[PDB]
Ligand binder design. Structure first.
Ligand SMILES: NC(=O)C1=CN([C@@H]2O[C@H](COP(=O)(O)OP(=O)(O)OC[C@H]3O[C@@H](n4cnc5c(N)ncnc54)[C@H](O)[C@@H]3O)[C@@H](O)[C@H]2O)C=CC1
Ligand SMILES: NC(=O)C1=CN([C@@H]2O[C@H](COP(=O)(O)OP(=O)(O)OC[C@H]3O[C@@H](n4cnc5c(N)ncnc54)[C@H](O)[C@@H]3O)[C@@H](O)[C@H]2O)C=CC1
Ligand SMILES: O=CNC1CCCCC1
Ligand SMILES: O=CNC1CCCCC1
Ligand SMILES: [Zn+2]
Ligand SMILES: [Zn+2]
Ligand SMILES: [Zn+2]
Ligand SMILES: [Zn+2]
Lengths: 374, 374
């Protein structure tokens, strides 16, 4: 009874940086050709959503943020072939158009249809499906999941198993897949290796899960919040270090601990200094360091290229290197077959209406992932 | 004759930075345990030797530089098992001890016995075998080939084919192997790919050779000296560009030419700005950039880590990633089997006494490799 009609529903609108979200009514247009309107069931609070609030991640405001989520298709536009009304789906913050040079490449996943490099805050057609107080509101990464309903381009949604528990598998839409793939796909962690993981939030814990799945012998968690260490050990860290406890820079500490440098290191925070420290602590001739964290907008790091000339490899990735539409259904199937766990990442559950409390929990250091239910 | 005795011979001593080499008599001590004394036959002029003169590369002075060479063993110290008097040999500016964690790793080659990371300018035992006018003179990279005789540690020398032409295969001791391996081993250039090579000297031409051997479809040479372009095309470049001819930054030019970025780029100059430009010109989701050039001492580059977060891989390497003692004899055997050519790199051949003239040729832009003959 809503197909083809505007839907009025609640969403969390961000009108200004550094302010609480405003939970209020929005109007959601029906889907145009090759678009899908989704009734949201659950969405996680990822640090990247907070980066929009703080100005770390710049995208046009006002905006409906949220990108790690799962829901049920309410209606489809003309020409949609990959999902149908009633299907369970995960929106894809990195799309998979299937047609660009990146989608066609065996390794690449950062589809050229993304809205990250040159943010417009729109659908693929350059327009918005959201109105609030009569004003157009921007989308975020082609997802915008902090709303009871959203509209996404078909290349930004994947159909998943009809029996999936949406309050858990929403994490496959960003944080779990990112960390897990960063270890198993991007770094390609090897059996018996030593790994160092900087940042023990939801994404860093998922990196640990992937390093353990790959058979690493040592997994050193690094965080300035020692309250993060117990869960890190539960999911596979063999030891944890707090840089604030040491008189020496932690790259020196980690080099000593690993008898000359780690095999694989991961920056899962989003600071320029820890990106350079993480590179430095891998072994100078054969180490690999992967940047996962988001840097503050437009800022450059400084580093000595002799760190690379000796033989290190430095890389980064979005979404764990996974081609998003191909990979998300398979990761859900693997979760349903118990191949990895999501419960360790979920520390808090709240209704959507308590979104601001959910962001308070993240900012205070108390949560890993808070899941919001609609 | 000479075995077990001090040898007085001619060498090129660098007494201080930014001065001509001084060609004069030096005394070369006999080899101690596990050392090898070599009569030099030919040595190439690599830009890294010039970096010692200019202060770009810091190593203790006064010094006998030179590291790209070939000669004949004159005598061996106690315990040497891998070469014998009369053998043709290439000194190894990166050693291969066979016992450190890097030598044991399948990928690594930057053996921990190297004299690059913390230059001492000595033999492995911390002492020098050279005296000149009664003063001790430093070694360079455990090689020191600008002398009629040198003494090296066993781990810094490889025995090669007795029929090898030393006036050509000296280049396998540094510049050829570095550039070729940077393409075929470090980057692992793929068939049909597009490559960009910054710097068209001896090392960058060897990168082009390797890209062509790997089957690249397009190889774009980049140099500010257009006189380098004809030879670059002879060895495989499909086009060449001079940044000075363009109003736009060359990274933008190369991105446009390659319809969104190259597959592989190589910095083969030694400038911070070209290291960042070369990274930027590879495709943002799956491109690979390899640093080969030597940065000026103690200087840091500045770069935006979003270049990596999208999916690029940045790496560097010494000596093309080759494990030096294993690889040098095989590369000579490959040369003798006609698997690659060295003549395109050799533009001038001069007697050793004309070393300063050979450096003037390099500095003026007029040579690729000058081979000095003893
Ligand atoms: N590449 C990608 O596709 C994705 C990137 N991200 C980014 O990954 C990063 C991590 O995200 P979450 O795990 O959700 O964030 P989080 O905020 O839950 O975790 C970050 C952790 O870093 C620790 N930390 C902060 N400063 C530190 C320092 N100086 N040294 C050591 N530890 C420090 C914190 O105590 C915290 O436990 C964020 O920048 C986020 O934007 C997130 C998802 C996808
Ligand atoms: N990684 C390693 O193992 C090795 C590194 N090297 C380093 O590789 C670099 C290249 O060495 P060679 O080929 O012997 O040097 P070279 O001096 O013969 O070649 C350098 C080329 O760069 C060009 N160039 C200079 N400035 C430029 C700019 N701004 N833009 C574009 N082109 C520019 C020059 O015109 C020249 O053709 C040097 O820094 C050298 O020290 C050399 C041997 C081994
Ligand atoms: O968290 C989801 N996506 C992130 C990916 C890294 C850049 C900022 C957006
Ligand atoms: O040219 C030979 N070796 C080079 C290797 C890169 C650092 C400077 C010295
Ligand atoms: Zn695409
Ligand atoms: Zn996220
Ligand atoms: Zn070694
Ligand atoms: Zn050299």
């Amino acid at each position: 009874s809503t197909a083809g009609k505007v839907i009025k529903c609640k969403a969390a609108v961000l009108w200004e940086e550094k302010k609480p979200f405003s939970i209020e009514e929005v109007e959601v247009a029906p889907p145009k050709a090759h678009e899908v309107r989704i009734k949201m069931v659950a969405t996680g609070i990822c640090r990247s959503d907070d980066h929009v609030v703080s100005g770390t991640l710049v995208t046009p405001l006002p905006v409906i943020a949220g990108h790690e989520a799962a829901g049920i298709v309410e209606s489809i536009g003309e020409g949609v072939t990959t999902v149908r009304p009633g299907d369970k789906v995960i929106p894809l913050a990195t799309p998979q158009c299937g047609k660009c040079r990146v989608c066609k490449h065996p390794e690449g996943n950062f589809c050229l249809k993304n809205d990250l490099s040159m943010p417009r805050g729109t659908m693929q057609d350059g327009t918005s499906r959201f109105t609030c107080r009569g004003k157009p509101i921007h989308h975020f990464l082609g997802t915008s999941t902090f709303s009871q309903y959203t509209v996404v381009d078909e290349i930004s949604v994947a159909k998943i198993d009809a029996a999936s528990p949406l309050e858990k598998v929403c994490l496959i839409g960003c944080g779990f897949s990112t960390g897990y793939g960063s270890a198993v796909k991007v770094a390609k962690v090897t059996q018996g290796s030593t790994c160092a993981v900087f940042g023990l939030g939801g994404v860093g814990l998922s990196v640990i899960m992937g390093c353990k799945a790959a058979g690493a012998a040592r997994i050193i968690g690094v965080d300035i919040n020692k309250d993060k260490f117990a869960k890190a050990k539960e999911v596979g860290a063999t030891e944890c270090v707090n840089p604030q406890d040491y008189k020496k820079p932690i790259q020196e500490v980690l080099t000593e601990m690993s008898n000359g440098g780690v095999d694989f290191s991961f920056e899962v925070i989003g600071r320029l200094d820890t990106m350079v420290t993480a590179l430095s602590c891998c072994q100078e001739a054969y180490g690999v360091s992967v940047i996962v964290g988001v840097p503050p907008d437009s800022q450059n790091l400084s580093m000595n290229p002799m760190l690379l000339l000796s033989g290190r490899t430095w890389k980064g990735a979005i979404f764990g290197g996974f081609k998003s539409k191909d990979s998300v259904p398979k990761l859900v199937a693997d979760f349903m077959a118990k191949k990895f766990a999501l419960d360790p990442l979920i520390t808090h559950v709240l209704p959507f209406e308590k979104i601001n409390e959910g962001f308070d929990l993240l900012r205070s250091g108390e949560s890993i992932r808070t899941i919001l239910t609609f």
